Amino acid sequence: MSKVGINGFGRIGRLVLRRLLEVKSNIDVVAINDLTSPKILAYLLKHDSNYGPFPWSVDFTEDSLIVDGKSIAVYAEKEAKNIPWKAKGAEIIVECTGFYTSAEKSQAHLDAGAKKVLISAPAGEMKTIVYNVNDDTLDGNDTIVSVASCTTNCLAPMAKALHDSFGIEVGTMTTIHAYTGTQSLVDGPRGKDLRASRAAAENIIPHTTGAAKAIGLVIPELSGKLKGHAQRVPVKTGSVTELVSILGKKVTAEEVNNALKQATTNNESFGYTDEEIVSSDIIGSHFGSVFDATQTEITAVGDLQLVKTVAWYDNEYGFVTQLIRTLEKFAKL
Amino acid sequence: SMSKVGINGFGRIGRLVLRRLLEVKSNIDVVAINDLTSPKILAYLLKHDSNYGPFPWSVDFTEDSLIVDGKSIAVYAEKEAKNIPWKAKGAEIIVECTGFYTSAEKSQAHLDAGAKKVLISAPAGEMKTIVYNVNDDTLDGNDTIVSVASCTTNCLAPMAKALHDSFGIEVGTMTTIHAYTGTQSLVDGPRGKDLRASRAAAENIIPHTTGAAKAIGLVIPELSGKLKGHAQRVPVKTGSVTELVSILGKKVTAEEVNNALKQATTNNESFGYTDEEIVSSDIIGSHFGSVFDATQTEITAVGDLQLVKTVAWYDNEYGFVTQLIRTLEKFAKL
Amino acid sequence: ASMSKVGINGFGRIGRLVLRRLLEVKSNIDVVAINDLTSPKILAYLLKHDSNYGPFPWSVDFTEDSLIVDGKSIAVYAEKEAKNIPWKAKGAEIIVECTGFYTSAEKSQAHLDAGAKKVLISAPAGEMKTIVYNVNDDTLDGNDTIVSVASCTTNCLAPMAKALHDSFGIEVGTMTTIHAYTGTQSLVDGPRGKDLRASRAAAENIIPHTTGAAKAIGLVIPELSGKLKGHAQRVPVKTGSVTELVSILGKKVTAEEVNNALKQATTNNESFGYTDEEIVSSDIIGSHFGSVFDATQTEITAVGDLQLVKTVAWYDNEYGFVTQLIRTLEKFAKL
Amino acid sequence: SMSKVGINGFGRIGRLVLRRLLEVKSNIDVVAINDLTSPKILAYLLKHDSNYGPFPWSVDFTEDSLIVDGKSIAVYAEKEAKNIPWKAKGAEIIVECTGFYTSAEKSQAHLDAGAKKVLISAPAGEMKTIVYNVNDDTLDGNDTIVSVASCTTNCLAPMAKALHDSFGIEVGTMTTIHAYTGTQSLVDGPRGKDLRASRAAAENIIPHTTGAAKAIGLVIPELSGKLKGHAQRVPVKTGSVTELVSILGKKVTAEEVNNALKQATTNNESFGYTDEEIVSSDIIGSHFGSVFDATQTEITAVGDLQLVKTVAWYDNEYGFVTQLIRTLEKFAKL
Numbered sequence A: 001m002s003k004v005g006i007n008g009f010g011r012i013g014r015l016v017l018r019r020l021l022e023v024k025s026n027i028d029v030v031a032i033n034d035l036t037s038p039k040i041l042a043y044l045l046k047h048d049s050n051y052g053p054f055p056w057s058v059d060f061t062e063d064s065l066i067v068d069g070k071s072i073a074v075y076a077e078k079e080a081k082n083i084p085w086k087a088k089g090a091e092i093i094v095e096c097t098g099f100y101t102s103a104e105k106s107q108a109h110l111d112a113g114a115k116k117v118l119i120s121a122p123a124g125e126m127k128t129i130v131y132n133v134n135d136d137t138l139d140g141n142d143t144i145v146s147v148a149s150c151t152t153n154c155l156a157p158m159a160k161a162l163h164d165s166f167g168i169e170v171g172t173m174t175t176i177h178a179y180t181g182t183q184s185l186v187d188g189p190r191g192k193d194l195r196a197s198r199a200a201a202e203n204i205i206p207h208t209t210g211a212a213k214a215i216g217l218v219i220p221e222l223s224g225k226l227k228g229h230a231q232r233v234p235v236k237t238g239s240v241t242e243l244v245s246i247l248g249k250k251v252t253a254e255e256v257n258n259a260l261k262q263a264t265t266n267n268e269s270f271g272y273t274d275e276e277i278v279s280s281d282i283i284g285s286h287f288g289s290v291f292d293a294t295q296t297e298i299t300a301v302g303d304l305q306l307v308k309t310v311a312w313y314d315n316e317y318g319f320v321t322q323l324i325r326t327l328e329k330f331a332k333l
Numbered sequence B, D: 001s002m003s004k005v006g007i008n009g010f011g012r013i014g015r016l017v018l019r020r021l022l023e024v025k026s027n028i029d030v031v032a033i034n035d036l037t038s039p040k041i042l043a044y045l046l047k048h049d050s051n052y053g054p055f056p057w058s059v060d061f062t063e064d065s066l067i068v069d070g071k072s073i074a075v076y077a078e079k080e081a082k083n084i085p086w087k088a089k090g091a092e093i094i095v096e097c098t099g100f101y102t103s104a105e106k107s108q109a110h111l112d113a114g115a116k117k118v119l120i121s122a123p124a125g126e127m128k129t130i131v132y133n134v135n136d137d138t139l140d141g142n143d144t145i146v147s148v149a150s151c152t153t154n155c156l157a158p159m160a161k162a163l164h165d166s167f168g169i170e171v172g173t174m175t176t177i178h179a180y181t182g183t184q185s186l187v188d189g190p191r192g193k194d195l196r197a198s199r200a201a202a203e204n205i206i207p208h209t210t211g212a213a214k215a216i217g218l219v220i221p222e223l224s225g226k227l228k229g230h231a232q233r234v235p236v237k238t239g240s241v242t243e244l245v246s247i248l249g250k251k252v253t254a255e256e257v258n259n260a261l262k263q264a265t266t267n268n269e270s271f272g273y274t275d276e277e278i279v280s281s282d283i284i285g286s287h288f289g290s291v292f293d294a295t296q297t298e299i300t301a302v303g304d305l306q307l308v309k310t311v312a313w314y315d316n317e318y319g320f321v322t323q324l325i326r327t328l329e330k331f332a333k334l
Numbered sequence C: 001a002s003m004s005k006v007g008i009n010g011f012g013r014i015g016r017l018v019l020r021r022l023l024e025v026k027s028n029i030d031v032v033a034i035n036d037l038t039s040p041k042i043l044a045y046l047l048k049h050d051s052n053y054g055p056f057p058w059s060v061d062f063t064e065d066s067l068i069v070d071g072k073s074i075a076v077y078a079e080k081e082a083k084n085i086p087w088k089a090k091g092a093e094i095i096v097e098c099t100g101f102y103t104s105a106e107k108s109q110a111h112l113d114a115g116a117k118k119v120l121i122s123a124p125a126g127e128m129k130t131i132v133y134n135v136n137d138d139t140l141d142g143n144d145t146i147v148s149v150a151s152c153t154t155n156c157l158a159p160m161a162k163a164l165h166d167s168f169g170i171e172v173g174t175m176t177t178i179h180a181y182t183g184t185q186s187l188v189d190g191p192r193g194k195d196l197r198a199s200r201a202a203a204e205n206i207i208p209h210t211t212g213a214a215k216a217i218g219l220v221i222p223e224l225s226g227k228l229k230g231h232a233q234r235v236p237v238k239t240g241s242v243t244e245l246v247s248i249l250g251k252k253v254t255a256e257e258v259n260n261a262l263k264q265a266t267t268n269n270e271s272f273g274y275t276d277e278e279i280v281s282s283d284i285i286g287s288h289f290g291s292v293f294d295a296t297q298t299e300i301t302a303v304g305d306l307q308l309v310k311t312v313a314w315y316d317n318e319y320g321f322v323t324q325l326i327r328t329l330e331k332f333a334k335l
């Protein structure tokens, strides 16, 4: 299988294409489904507010995109069951619309003639993969798999290293997170979520995330031991996750940091920095998560000890690089 | 005399319509609201405003209503206007603020649904179109559907009218540097067919079409076909400014243009004047439709060839709403 | 009827709102003098036009050496060094110190040398009486001459910590505040003292930032010295900020139980408010509280007998902090 | 030799100057940098850029130097240019990017400090002022202090040149909608005597004077006195756009203007062309001084009279910098 369809050519969907081409994958994107014309998807692909001009040629026809000389079909089917995946033989669907985050929903891509589905979001009780953490759990028999959220790919490698070195007995996270398409431009209805209805570029907005609640799926031993949430803020991309943990051993900052450095060495998914970076330095990062040793903090009072560890993430591109790693491997089995 | 109002589209404009009605202690009585959501969500949005802060009156809700300052207001959720039960509470004048009924053909559905008149908060083609204190004397008892044009029109028109009256505008072109609005996009993604509107509004200067100058003839007939213009949408949440570059009908100095504008703003509740070094946030919550800024006036001349740039600020949300309400209160007494 | 005469040093974001708040509440204090680094014209323009709070609610004019505010004169000086400020010329006896450059006993001493009697500093100023109104203002007496009101963050954190302490005990905790950007940061990438992160464009980044609010909490709640640490993340909102605290408390608790203890702590408490509405930061702008506890963000995380407790409070680091500074100033001035 | 360069002001422009020189593999050799801080801090700023991302070469520092791509650059901290020890490493041409030496009299100080020539990164009064590919042919061997004018001059000049050559410009006025810069304020507070410059830059539309139009005569002598203009500073970090409204010497169509402009941009490394529906973030990183935008051309005509609006984008940081470097590469070989 090296024949891929993208459902939802949005922020994540367009970067999936950018990244496959950046690394010369032997995967060919042959079809795209969205809700618009080829002309509009081409304008969007060619001109990116966050990452600049497309590095390759982009043109269109009435029913297709021409990207670096290759034709890619464009469909506009609102319901995934009606998508002609069979037409160009789309074998693996990268599902990035947000409207098919379950086994039962992404089932419709199978019923429309696809073999597998990789969902770019948490998708309930299914095999959920952070690359370089639990991707060894994938087999030939898997059809519909999830890569969880940007936050889950940030949190998990940091949690994994802490759990391996020290044990995490209990923990809570806060991610300070760039605003996304789920939020609003101006104050107005955004389904049931009251907070999501508020102008995203003019507010700090508390926001639910299951990254920590559903970490059980990626790190089985931490199942039900983490909770967390987000504060969405007015940066366009680039985020950071703080974890506060009661660990299984007394530790020093240097000790926590050395252990993290160890876990990041020749680790293409998980980086390290000892530099005084800010969110914009993470934009275009090729990691899922970059641990920041400068923000490590140990608060100790006797027996009791709280350990704050902080990792950066490019929630768009960084998360994507993880999505592509997982995709390449899903596609070889 | 016609005191009972329905609001269709309880959005940025619709919410502030109510805020401004209560602020001026109008005898107009908002009896019903229609939108696409629950009373709970509307009540949340009404209490809490990112641009203007906490609502100055109490806000609660029921399964089917808002309770604002102790007074009950019915809430309906009908997406097609012809199905709004305006008769239940005797809603007579509908303030149409959804963006989806911007023509006589479309807004007449409120009449079908049992209302008496419609005031549309946006341009709506070739119909009676009013900028208060510019052409509100053209209203009469036979007007049943009326437009107040756009924020931009309520800014430009009084500046243009003043220049028309004192000097003549032979030809001109407008550019408005305008706050982003809910028609734009939060992140890069499709936004109908307008390519530019697909781009992240808070992270970009975005060129944007607007008919304010194009359709000025509806408000000042003698300027019909003599102006063009466009917008540059920028990352401020509200507050905007309009520059007009004109060939006037007479040779002028900057001091002469400013005195003529000052005279037009004197005792004019719709049209302010300033020569303070203000910036956009100083216009947020303005009670004018337009505020002429004398500090930005510029005369460029070479022999007989003269270009005149005049500039006016406007709070495209609340300030425009003050005009909307002035127009509503007159409409209702006809 | 006590009419203390006040001078303001540093007519900045905080200094200006101090005057705004004093007139807003009709305080008996008269502000008789202001010192900054500029002309009365520039100070008048800034007082009149405010990007966060809108137009000044009172008339503002200037002469070559004064502001005229609602028809009252306020002398204007421009003395880089506080010892040269002529506070005696208009009888200014209580200086509200808001420049950032006199944050110690030894430095603010200069206001007394120059003829003032008391100084209240609008920031942490080391080992000195450090007041969060409605937490420890009863430590104030007639013998105090130089006092601090700590930071905005201390004024957010201390009431929430106080109530948790009083109700449950806190064994240990750690704080993160997601904080509006301020004048100590940069507009564009460029040198800002010695703090590398402060050099980066404030409106375009999440910027980690050290704050002493947790570390020095003991000056305000002595039982908690050494028990808390924390830091900030600076983000692109112009004002309005939120403080999270992750605590191990000395009792097992539920969320409801935590939220009820906080509610009771906020009852008839002019300094410390409560919400259970789904507010966001722009809803805190213009708050008349130093801190507003948010019941909606309370989180208990539990395994066996291990419980982590997250509590969260909003604050307008500008106006809200200023209401606290003014309460503290009214009491300080009457002693 | 004249291949050895010092940078005064290692700021937004100073650092991108070094970035650009390395990017085009110039045989210019930056031997010295002066600013007001430590090499630690300069190294941190060069390595990590909020607008352009990570520096593409290595950066380390010592107590008195930077090491950029393995090459040592001396760092001084002399707030008065007369005291900068340029002779120590033999800096002959100074790229003056502080903003504090924007006159012949002031930049003379670099020559008394032992340098041979100064290139000022801003307007600087009546001295030879260069927009590359408009009037770089005017530089000669004897010039010791020159200007590259502003970002806005580099954007306006080539558009005005093309219009001037093809149709004549009788008179015209300009408005640039311009990214905020370091002369503005993060929070409301004193900023010298420009009142508007004291207002929070990322929360306002802020009008602002610029000499781009007024001083155009230095770059295109025939347009001396024929243009005026100003800016509206808005909340984007870099990337700007310039609109010019002109009375031309001929009657024209939109297509005719667009084709003339397209001709002037053909094989022009300094002056780009687009007919794509771009927005400001699309110009960030541009290797042009100016990119004419055909999509925004507008002809407003009534009988005999005509106004023509033409629009060009520019990356006021990197794009302007690319013109500065073209000019410096010629300057160094005269």
Ligand SMILES: NC(=O)c1ccc[n+]([C@@H]2O[C@H](COP(=O)([O-])OP(=O)(O)OC[C@H]3O[C@@H](n4cnc5c(N)ncnc54)[C@H](O)[C@@H]3O)[C@@H](O)[C@H]2O)c1
Binding pocket: A007, A008, A009, A010, A011, A012, A013, A033, A034, A035, A077, A078, A079, A095, A096, A097, A098, A099, A120, A121, A148, A149, A150, A180, A181, A182, A315, A316, A319, B187, B188, B189, B190
């Ligand atoms: N942006 C992030 O930071 C981020 C990070 C990790 C994961 N994700 C996840 O990836 C998914 C996509 O997020 P995004 O940021 O790219 O969203 P987006 O809104 O930018 O993109 C959604 C795209 O899907 C299209 N679409 C919507 N409904 C559709 C349908 N029924 N059929 C076909 N196309 C449809 C839209 O037109 C749009 O192009 C979401 O599930 C999100 O939770 C997002």
Ligand SMILES: NC(=O)c1ccc[n+]([C@@H]2O[C@H](COP(=O)([O-])OP(=O)(O)OC[C@H]3O[C@@H](n4cnc5c(N)ncnc54)[C@H](O)[C@@H]3O)[C@@H](O)[C@H]2O)c1
Binding pocket: A186, A187, A188, A189, B008, B009, B010, B011, B012, B013, B014, B034, B035, B036, B078, B079, B080, B096, B097, B098, B099, B100, B121, B122, B149, B150, B151, B181, B182, B183, B316, B317, B320
């Ligand atoms: N925001 C401005 O600056 C501004 C200024 C002047 C005029 N206007 C005009 O006012 C109108 C409203 O603008 P807005 O900014 O308040 O938009 P908005 O998106 O904030 O509000 C639209 C509201 O109408 C609701 N709505 C959408 N479709 C509906 C339907 N079929 N039936 C009932 N409700 C529906 C939405 O749920 C929302 O509450 C538009 O025509 C706009 O052009 C806007």
Ligand SMILES: NC(=O)c1ccc[n+]([C@@H]2O[C@H](COP(=O)([O-])OP(=O)(O)OC[C@H]3O[C@@H](n4cnc5c(N)ncnc54)[C@H](O)[C@@H]3O)[C@@H](O)[C@H]2O)c1
Binding pocket: C009, C010, C011, C012, C013, C014, C015, C035, C036, C037, C079, C080, C081, C097, C098, C099, C100, C101, C122, C123, C150, C151, C152, C153, C182, C183, C317, C318, C321, D187, D188, D189, D190
């Ligand atoms: N969020 C907040 O802004 C906030 C909250 C709580 C406490 N504080 C504290 O209050 C103090 C002021 O903060 P700000 O935000 O008002 O700063 P600011 O920069 O807005 O104001 C400082 C003012 O002091 C002037 N100044 C500088 N040095 C001076 C000197 N030697 N003499 C006289 N005037 C001088 C400046 O011209 C400016 O007007 C700081 O100590 C700060 O930590 C700030």
Ligand SMILES: NC(=O)c1ccc[n+]([C@@H]2O[C@H](COP(=O)([O-])OP(=O)(O)OC[C@H]3O[C@@H](n4cnc5c(N)ncnc54)[C@H](O)[C@@H]3O)[C@@H](O)[C@H]2O)c1
Binding pocket: C188, C189, C190, C191, D008, D009, D010, D011, D012, D013, D014, D034, D035, D036, D078, D079, D080, D096, D097, D098, D099, D100, D102, D121, D122, D149, D150, D151, D152, D181, D182, D183, D316, D317, D320
């Ligand atoms: N940023 C733009 O958009 C832009 C575009 C075109 C031209 N310019 C011009 O280029 C020049 C620099 O602009 P910038 O945006 O890089 O400014 P900036 O504030 O980022 O850079 C100024 C640099 O000079 C240093 N400095 C200040 N005074 C000094 C002194 N006496 N001696 C040595 N160093 C000193 C500062 O520390 C800083 O590193 C200005 O003249 C400006 O007009 C700027």
Ligand SMILES: O=C[C@H](O)COP(=O)(O)O
Binding pocket: A011, A179, A180, A181, A182, B187
């Ligand atoms: O731009 C982003 C999407 O619509 C939502 O992504 P999210 O699920 O990460 O909030």
Ligand SMILES: O=C[C@H](O)COP(=O)(O)O
Binding pocket: B099, B150, B181, B182, B183, B184
């Ligand atoms: O949908 C939200 C706004 O109404 C759009 O306002 P606008 O029509 O002025 O762009």
Ligand SMILES: O=C[C@H](O)COP(=O)(O)O
Binding pocket: C013, C100, C182, C183, C184, C185, D187
């Ligand atoms: O100049 C001082 C700043 O305006 C205030 O910032 P701070 O509250 O971070 O100290």
Ligand SMILES: O=C[C@H](O)COP(=O)(O)O
Binding pocket: D012, D099, D150, D181, D182, D183, D184
């Ligand atoms: O600090 C200097 C500013 O960055 C320069 O830009 P400007 O002079 O074009 O405002």
Ligand SMILES: [Cl-]
Binding pocket: B210, B211, B213, B214, B227, B228, B229, B230
């Ligand atoms: Cl037009």
Ligand SMILES: [Cl-]
Binding pocket: B152, B176, B178, B208, B209, B210, B231
């Ligand atoms: Cl517009």
Ligand SMILES: [Cl-]
Binding pocket: C211, C212, C214, C215, C228, C229, C230, C231
């Ligand atoms: Cl600490």
Ligand SMILES: [Cl-]
Binding pocket: D210, D211, D213, D214, D227, D228, D229, D230
């Ligand atoms: Cl001019």
Ligand SMILES: [Cl-]
Binding pocket: D152, D176, D178, D208, D209, D210, D231
């Ligand atoms: Cl400018």
